[PDB]
Amino acid sequence: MKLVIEGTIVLKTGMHIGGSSDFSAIGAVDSPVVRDTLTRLPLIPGSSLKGKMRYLLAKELNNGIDQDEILRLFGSSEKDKIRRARLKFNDIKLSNLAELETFNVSSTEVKFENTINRKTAVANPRQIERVIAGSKFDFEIFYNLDDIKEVEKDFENIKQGFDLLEFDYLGGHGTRGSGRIAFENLSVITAVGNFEKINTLNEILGA
Amino acid sequence: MKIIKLYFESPVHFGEKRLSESKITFSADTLFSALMIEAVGLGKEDEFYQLASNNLVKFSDAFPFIDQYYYIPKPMFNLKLEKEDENPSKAFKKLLYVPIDSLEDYLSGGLDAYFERESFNLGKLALSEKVQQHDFKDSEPYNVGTFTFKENTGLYVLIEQTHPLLEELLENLQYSGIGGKRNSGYGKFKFEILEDSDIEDLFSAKGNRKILLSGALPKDAELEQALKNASYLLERRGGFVQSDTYATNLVKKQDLYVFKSGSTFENSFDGDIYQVGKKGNHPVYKYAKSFFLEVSV
Amino acid sequence: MDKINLVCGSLLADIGKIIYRGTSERAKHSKLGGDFIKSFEQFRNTELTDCIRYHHAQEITSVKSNKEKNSLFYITYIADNISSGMDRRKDLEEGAEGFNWDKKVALGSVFNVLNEKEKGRQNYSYPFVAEPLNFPTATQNQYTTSYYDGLITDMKTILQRLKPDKEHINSLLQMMESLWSYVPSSTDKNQLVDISLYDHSRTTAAIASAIYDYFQAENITDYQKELFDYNATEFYDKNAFLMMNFDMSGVQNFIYNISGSKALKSLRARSFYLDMLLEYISDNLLEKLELSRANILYVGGGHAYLLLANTNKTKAILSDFEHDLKTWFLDKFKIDLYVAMAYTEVSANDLMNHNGHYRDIYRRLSQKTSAKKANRYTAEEILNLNHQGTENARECRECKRSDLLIEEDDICEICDSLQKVSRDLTRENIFVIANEGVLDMPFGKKMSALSYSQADKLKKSNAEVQIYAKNISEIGQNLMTRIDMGDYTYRSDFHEMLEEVEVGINRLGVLRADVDNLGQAFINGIPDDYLSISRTATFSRAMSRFFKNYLNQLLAEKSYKINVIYAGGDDLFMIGAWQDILDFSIVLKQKFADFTQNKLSISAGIGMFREKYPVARMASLTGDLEDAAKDYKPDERAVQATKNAVTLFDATNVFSWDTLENDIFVKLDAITKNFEKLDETGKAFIYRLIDLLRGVNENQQINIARLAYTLSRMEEKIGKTFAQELYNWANADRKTLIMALEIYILKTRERAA
Ligand SMILES: Nc1ncnc2c1ncn2[C@@H]1O[C@H](COP(=O)(O)OP(=O)(O)OP(=O)(O)O)[C@@H](O)[C@H]1O
Ligand SMILES: [Mg+2]
Ligand SMILES: [Mg+2]
Ligand SMILES: [Mg+2]
């Protein structure tokens, strides 16, 4: 009844999520990225991926024409319609550490930018911390198969959300060249119970 | 007896009253609510409720374990009556959890108050800073209080006489999470049943002092006798009902005041599964059964 | 005989000490003081004068035959003996011609003998003044005759507008506190002169009141036989007093565990509410027991000690008071707030430590308080708590409770009254406790922070109106009660104050300081030989007045951008601009070390948060940092932590106060004086220095080489000598260097402020 959607997020152009507005993070860089609390490794929070995926899916499923297919996946508690959820996101830790040390490189970088005034032609630099491209994040998303007739449509929408992410960014200054990601090794396996239509769900994810 | 060891591979959010704060443990009513929600999901809430109410399954609340050291909240003992020397309950105030095996050392003194604190090192708290992105309005920020466990650290629950239904709900509870923002990336653990014989020695022993090991509320017919040479602390349990088919709107459950899970009693009591939601479509239960560890005082 | 006469005579018993060492008459101080009180017509009923004139053995013996029994001055004499302790009890009286009395000695500090088993004994004293707080100095200093003459003229001014009535006892006590606080009660060497006249007289009045009430309950009308005719051994043995232990629980959760958007504004309001709650409860119980304010040995910090009479009437009143207080607290704050009321029976020998266990008083009082806090509610209050549960769709915005809500707003009644009083909490405001007000109070009263003018048209024609003020001018008339609490607010907005600094990071600073081992100092800090109720009261008053009054005055000395939430006792909670908080941390440490002359140490935790950070998490995190500073232990071989440390923004940056000041601040000063002419590439170079220094632990060689290269790149706008200095620091004192560099980056960050 519970499916585990596995996969990997590969950074393509450098990704900047979040603000760690505590003294330790801000004392070493102007705008830090979210790190693990203990290991201090970069992570993709489940909320960030979930929110961006939901935003793209809500755009695409309406397209100027939320709806039930979004509320059943991500939940709702607004005023009278309360669907709990079917997708259970998890905080995505950095999986490429031993691979990144073979390159003698740190997992994070500082990108030096600036803005140039248009009235006075005066520039002003800024630094943003960013998770370097080539970093990998293995994620697990748990699906609660509440309905047997809607699982195929839910997984079609999940694949659509992943595809929309692949042609978008994930966190931070995306339109200025950051946060481009790719999805690889996408698969779904039944963790609890028996589900004979897991093969077609893998076909949807492997599409 | 059948210690349910929880290994968390994500930061947890166990809220007391606010989303910006997290506590390192979760209570027995929280675990019971999680398992009852799982049972509703897989359609045998009545069987689980009958198991819990008939004492077929009764569990303590989550306690820290650090490298095969099982901890217990510092019991509220009527001792410190050693009125000559030492620092009884003076340096034993920042000490929140004592090892379950070292409880006899703590009873008669000699436990190092300082050393028991830096030895107790389970993860650390953090605040996750988030927003609700609005496409044309101003994005509204919000933050979640989280706790991240360490490598060889987690939580454990004392269950005696485990059940197939409890094991089946625990397997499903792996992939739904426990705690506050579990549908976000916060509720994620692995569990083991891990029968233990050292702990069974402690719980097979009798004594004149009963350490309450779960948030419990004695029934009205036994509260008076429970309150007799008792050294307890009263805790409020409540919050919003978490269900889809209740009241069609968010409603808080009734506040239940129970004995905190470090309290010590001389008279044993068995609590109850209290119904803290009665105006909705389904009952809402608050697990307040008593889990006791007996010692000599 | 009237009890008020005994109270006034015991308060003014040593009036003649200041009278005698202020003028030139050469007579016994009791006689001179009796004549001085005789100079006022309202203070003339022969009972006042009998208590003032005859409170010593020789004077009583000279007139005991002529005076009748139960004459109220035996009580004052025995109360003076009890308050003295192991000090002089029956010897020559000041002003007599059998000795040469030095009328010019200053009072010593109580910290001269505090912790002397490990820190030694020393001879400090207070220089005379004329607030402001008087600090102790090692230099020997004298009290000129002009000092006591000015004291005498101010006392003549105040005493003309005073009466021996019930409502003027507070005014008399305020006079004594203002004037006698810095005059010795004994100008005799070969002993300790550290007891003030105010503390000695207050203890004597409290003991005399308790003894009188005990005597009335026990039906004793032979004070001469029972006290003076013999050495009062039988009286000294019997338990005539009660030591009571008002103890408030859950103040941290009530004050700081809130989640409103405007939750920073209400912190001071909640702290003030709890402080005045405790003060009002103590005053109410005192007036229910017909006792004076002198019987409050200590109040503040969510704790109150009262000296009572071991009588059945007192115990019945205590039971009724406790029941009413418990019901009121349960009604308003279900379990969030609680006051524990425990008392123990003590004897005059216990108070004087003659039997050797004066400390057992507080030992068993603490035992009783812990026993009462372990079993707070009976098995009917819990039942009522569980039965008054309702399913609610609404809850308080910041107090998150579903009861006592307002019909048009999701906020609790306490939660709205606190916001109101926070809006009316400003400088030079007094507090009125009447039947009408804003904040709910126990026993059917309400409290407002309304101003002076609209308070004058509230007591001139009304019944049972109580006025509380921070400052009292013209002590005699306009009867108020002075309440002390740290409440210095530079600016209550908390937002314009942040947008007042121009250089630095836009961060709030939270300071939480706490004296290390103050309870241990109260237990065994004072040597057993110098143990008395007067010395204990002197130490308690020193600590409390320091925190409240002197923190206010010190923060007012220079315009620190601080918004003190609570000072109280032994603790401190202040929020302000993080640079001002960091600058004031060292000033606070130095001022405390001067005031105690290094007999007690203080631990602090400094947190740095943004404006919109949750106030509950600010409090919790800064408390964690303060606990980490209290965990400071440089070597893992000693017993108990050193505790004399400060935590800087994170539990890993725990440094001792000497280490912080010397190392970190000289490094920060050098960095500031050498880095001001760096370019904007130099800022990135400092960032890289910090990263390399942090990574040095896992990269021994390559990272130190990279640091050398970075210093090479930098040593064109900073100089070669400072590059070498930084390189030497990095290999010798790295964590201090990292701390200083991070502080410099945050202080010089050009991201507004
Ligand atoms: N009005 C106040 N405002 C702010 N802080 C206060 C106030 N009154 C007291 N405090 C401080 O709060 C600290 C803890 O008080 P609290 O009663 O919540 O815990 P506690 O001392 O451990 O007592 P208990 O064991 O009964 O809970 C004390 O150090 C006290 O100085
Ligand atoms: Mg207390
Ligand atoms: Mg302290
Ligand atoms: Mg304290």
PDB file of C-alpha atoms in Angstrom, chain B residues 17-22 78 80-81 83 87 90-91 94 112 114 117-118 124-127 129 143-146 217-220 223-224 227-236 240-241 246 250-259 276-280, chain C residues 253 257-259 334-336 360 363 367 370-371 373-380 382-383 385-387 389-395 397-403 519-520 523 610 612-614 616-618 620-621 624 626-627 630-633 640-641 650:
ATOM      1  CA  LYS B  17       2.970  23.633  21.269  1.00  0.00           C
ATOM      2  CA  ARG B  18       4.657  25.467  18.366  1.00  0.00           C
ATOM      3  CA  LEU B  19       6.108  24.651  14.958  1.00  0.00           C
ATOM      4  CA  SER B  20       9.289  26.638  15.687  1.00  0.00           C
ATOM      5  CA  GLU B  21      10.305  24.339  18.571  1.00  0.00           C
ATOM      6  CA  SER B  22      11.122  20.635  18.642  1.00  0.00           C
ATOM      7  CA  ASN B  78      11.289  11.755  47.073  1.00  0.00           C
ATOM      8  CA  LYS B  80      17.697  13.862  48.386  1.00  0.00           C
ATOM      9  CA  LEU B  81      16.861  13.254  52.053  1.00  0.00           C
ATOM     10  CA  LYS B  83      20.746  16.233  54.455  1.00  0.00           C
ATOM     11  CA  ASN B  87      24.545  18.095  45.945  1.00  0.00           C
ATOM     12  CA  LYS B  90      21.396  20.756  43.046  1.00  0.00           C
ATOM     13  CA  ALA B  91      23.552  19.551  40.160  1.00  0.00           C
ATOM     14  CA  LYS B  94      20.351  20.054  34.345  1.00  0.00           C
ATOM     15  CA  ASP B 112      28.308  11.985  38.511  1.00  0.00           C
ATOM     16  CA  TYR B 114      28.436  16.540  35.443  1.00  0.00           C
ATOM     17  CA  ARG B 117      25.474  15.324  30.945  1.00  0.00           C
ATOM     18  CA  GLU B 118      28.355  15.589  28.455  1.00  0.00           C
ATOM     19  CA  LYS B 124      21.308  18.913  18.106  1.00  0.00           C
ATOM     20  CA  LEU B 125      18.335  21.165  17.451  1.00  0.00           C
ATOM     21  CA  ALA B 126      17.946  23.388  14.411  1.00  0.00           C
ATOM     22  CA  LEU B 127      15.484  25.827  12.883  1.00  0.00           C
ATOM     23  CA  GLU B 129      13.586  28.567   7.537  1.00  0.00           C
ATOM     24  CA  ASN B 143      10.023  28.223  10.232  1.00  0.00           C
ATOM     25  CA  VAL B 144      10.038  24.678  11.600  1.00  0.00           C
ATOM     26  CA  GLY B 145      11.873  23.546  14.714  1.00  0.00           C
ATOM     27  CA  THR B 146      13.754  20.329  14.055  1.00  0.00           C
ATOM     28  CA  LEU B 217      -3.781   9.608  33.742  1.00  0.00           C
ATOM     29  CA  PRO B 218      -5.331   7.347  36.403  1.00  0.00           C
ATOM     30  CA  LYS B 219      -9.075   6.860  36.207  1.00  0.00           C
ATOM     31  CA  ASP B 220     -11.327   8.842  38.534  1.00  0.00           C
ATOM     32  CA  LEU B 223      -6.712   9.022  41.068  1.00  0.00           C
ATOM     33  CA  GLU B 224      -7.092   9.567  44.819  1.00  0.00           C
ATOM     34  CA  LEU B 227      -2.028  10.665  44.670  1.00  0.00           C
ATOM     35  CA  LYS B 228      -0.528   9.220  47.844  1.00  0.00           C
ATOM     36  CA  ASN B 229       3.199   9.718  48.470  1.00  0.00           C
ATOM     37  CA  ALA B 230       3.475  10.534  44.764  1.00  0.00           C
ATOM     38  CA  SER B 231       6.135  12.813  43.273  1.00  0.00           C
ATOM     39  CA  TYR B 232       4.749  13.752  39.867  1.00  0.00           C
ATOM     40  CA  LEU B 233       4.540  16.555  37.329  1.00  0.00           C
ATOM     41  CA  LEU B 234       1.325  17.374  35.486  1.00  0.00           C
ATOM     42  CA  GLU B 235       1.508  17.861  31.714  1.00  0.00           C
ATOM     43  CA  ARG B 236      -1.067  19.194  29.254  1.00  0.00           C
ATOM     44  CA  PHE B 240      -5.583  19.801  16.688  1.00  0.00           C
ATOM     45  CA  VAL B 241      -7.247  16.597  15.544  1.00  0.00           C
ATOM     46  CA  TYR B 246     -13.566  14.793  11.321  1.00  0.00           C
ATOM     47  CA  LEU B 250      -9.679  22.051  11.869  1.00  0.00           C
ATOM     48  CA  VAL B 251     -10.746  21.648  15.499  1.00  0.00           C
ATOM     49  CA  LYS B 252      -8.685  21.267  18.658  1.00  0.00           C
ATOM     50  CA  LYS B 253      -9.220  18.225  20.842  1.00  0.00           C
ATOM     51  CA  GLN B 254      -9.980  18.543  24.544  1.00  0.00           C
ATOM     52  CA  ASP B 255      -6.997  19.278  26.757  1.00  0.00           C
ATOM     53  CA  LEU B 256      -6.003  16.243  28.821  1.00  0.00           C
ATOM     54  CA  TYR B 257      -3.723  16.704  31.824  1.00  0.00           C
ATOM     55  CA  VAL B 258      -1.650  13.585  32.477  1.00  0.00           C
ATOM     56  CA  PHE B 259       1.304  12.625  34.640  1.00  0.00           C
ATOM     57  CA  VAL B 276     -10.682  13.706  23.714  1.00  0.00           C
ATOM     58  CA  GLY B 277     -12.851  14.171  20.620  1.00  0.00           C
ATOM     59  CA  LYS B 278     -16.602  13.620  20.851  1.00  0.00           C
ATOM     60  CA  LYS B 279     -18.325  16.143  18.543  1.00  0.00           C
ATOM     61  CA  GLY B 280     -16.820  14.743  15.329  1.00  0.00           C
TER      62      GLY B 280
ATOM     63  CA  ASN C 253       7.351  29.200  29.860  1.00  0.00           C
ATOM     64  CA  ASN C 257       7.206  30.686  25.241  1.00  0.00           C
ATOM     65  CA  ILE C 258       5.009  32.863  23.025  1.00  0.00           C
ATOM     66  CA  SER C 259       4.570  32.952  19.264  1.00  0.00           C
ATOM     67  CA  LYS C 334      -4.327  26.178  34.452  1.00  0.00           C
ATOM     68  CA  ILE C 335      -0.880  24.692  35.126  1.00  0.00           C
ATOM     69  CA  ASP C 336       1.378  27.207  33.356  1.00  0.00           C
ATOM     70  CA  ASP C 360      19.313  23.761  58.535  1.00  0.00           C
ATOM     71  CA  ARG C 363      17.840  23.213  54.178  1.00  0.00           C
ATOM     72  CA  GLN C 367      13.081  20.270  51.380  1.00  0.00           C
ATOM     73  CA  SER C 370      10.477  20.569  46.882  1.00  0.00           C
ATOM     74  CA  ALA C 371       8.032  18.202  48.588  1.00  0.00           C
ATOM     75  CA  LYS C 373       6.195  21.183  44.280  1.00  0.00           C
ATOM     76  CA  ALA C 374       6.415  17.416  43.735  1.00  0.00           C
ATOM     77  CA  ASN C 375       2.707  17.010  44.625  1.00  0.00           C
ATOM     78  CA  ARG C 376       1.112  20.272  43.507  1.00  0.00           C
ATOM     79  CA  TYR C 377      -2.568  19.512  42.890  1.00  0.00           C
ATOM     80  CA  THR C 378      -4.951  17.316  44.863  1.00  0.00           C
ATOM     81  CA  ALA C 379      -7.088  14.630  43.264  1.00  0.00           C
ATOM     82  CA  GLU C 380      -9.912  17.079  42.686  1.00  0.00           C
ATOM     83  CA  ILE C 382      -6.802  17.427  38.366  1.00  0.00           C
ATOM     84  CA  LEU C 383     -10.343  16.115  37.915  1.00  0.00           C
ATOM     85  CA  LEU C 385      -8.839  20.395  34.979  1.00  0.00           C
ATOM     86  CA  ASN C 386      -9.757  17.367  32.880  1.00  0.00           C
ATOM     87  CA  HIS C 387     -13.505  18.053  33.074  1.00  0.00           C
ATOM     88  CA  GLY C 389     -11.993  20.589  28.511  1.00  0.00           C
ATOM     89  CA  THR C 390     -13.721  21.792  25.358  1.00  0.00           C
ATOM     90  CA  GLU C 391     -13.148  21.220  21.651  1.00  0.00           C
ATOM     91  CA  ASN C 392     -12.321  24.628  20.172  1.00  0.00           C
ATOM     92  CA  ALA C 393     -11.760  25.883  16.644  1.00  0.00           C
ATOM     93  CA  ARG C 394      -9.985  28.992  17.982  1.00  0.00           C
ATOM     94  CA  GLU C 395      -6.903  29.546  20.101  1.00  0.00           C
ATOM     95  CA  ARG C 397      -2.419  33.944  18.833  1.00  0.00           C
ATOM     96  CA  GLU C 398       0.616  33.892  21.145  1.00  0.00           C
ATOM     97  CA  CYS C 399      -0.552  31.984  24.243  1.00  0.00           C
ATOM     98  CA  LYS C 400      -2.159  29.250  22.076  1.00  0.00           C
ATOM     99  CA  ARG C 401      -4.815  28.532  24.710  1.00  0.00           C
ATOM    100  CA  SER C 402      -8.464  27.919  23.872  1.00  0.00           C
ATOM    101  CA  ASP C 403      -9.970  29.228  27.128  1.00  0.00           C
ATOM    102  CA  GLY C 519      23.056  29.141  46.116  1.00  0.00           C
ATOM    103  CA  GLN C 520      26.349  27.637  47.260  1.00  0.00           C
ATOM    104  CA  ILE C 523      24.644  27.957  51.910  1.00  0.00           C
ATOM    105  CA  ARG C 610      17.247  38.298  13.093  1.00  0.00           C
ATOM    106  CA  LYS C 612      11.631  38.064  12.921  1.00  0.00           C
ATOM    107  CA  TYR C 613      13.234  35.127  14.728  1.00  0.00           C
ATOM    108  CA  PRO C 614      10.753  33.538  17.173  1.00  0.00           C
ATOM    109  CA  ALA C 616      10.552  31.588  22.218  1.00  0.00           C
ATOM    110  CA  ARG C 617      13.480  30.232  20.230  1.00  0.00           C
ATOM    111  CA  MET C 618      15.607  33.288  21.042  1.00  0.00           C
ATOM    112  CA  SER C 620      15.569  28.843  24.434  1.00  0.00           C
ATOM    113  CA  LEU C 621      18.739  29.123  22.352  1.00  0.00           C
ATOM    114  CA  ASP C 624      21.242  26.812  25.938  1.00  0.00           C
ATOM    115  CA  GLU C 626      24.228  30.248  28.905  1.00  0.00           C
ATOM    116  CA  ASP C 627      24.099  26.611  30.048  1.00  0.00           C
ATOM    117  CA  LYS C 630      28.098  27.241  32.770  1.00  0.00           C
ATOM    118  CA  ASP C 631      29.471  23.925  31.462  1.00  0.00           C
ATOM    119  CA  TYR C 632      32.884  25.500  30.827  1.00  0.00           C
ATOM    120  CA  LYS C 633      35.643  23.311  32.267  1.00  0.00           C
ATOM    121  CA  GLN C 640      32.705  20.907  39.040  1.00  0.00           C
ATOM    122  CA  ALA C 641      32.877  23.318  36.107  1.00  0.00           C
ATOM    123  CA  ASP C 650      26.931  29.176  19.440  1.00  0.00           C
TER     124      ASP C 650
END
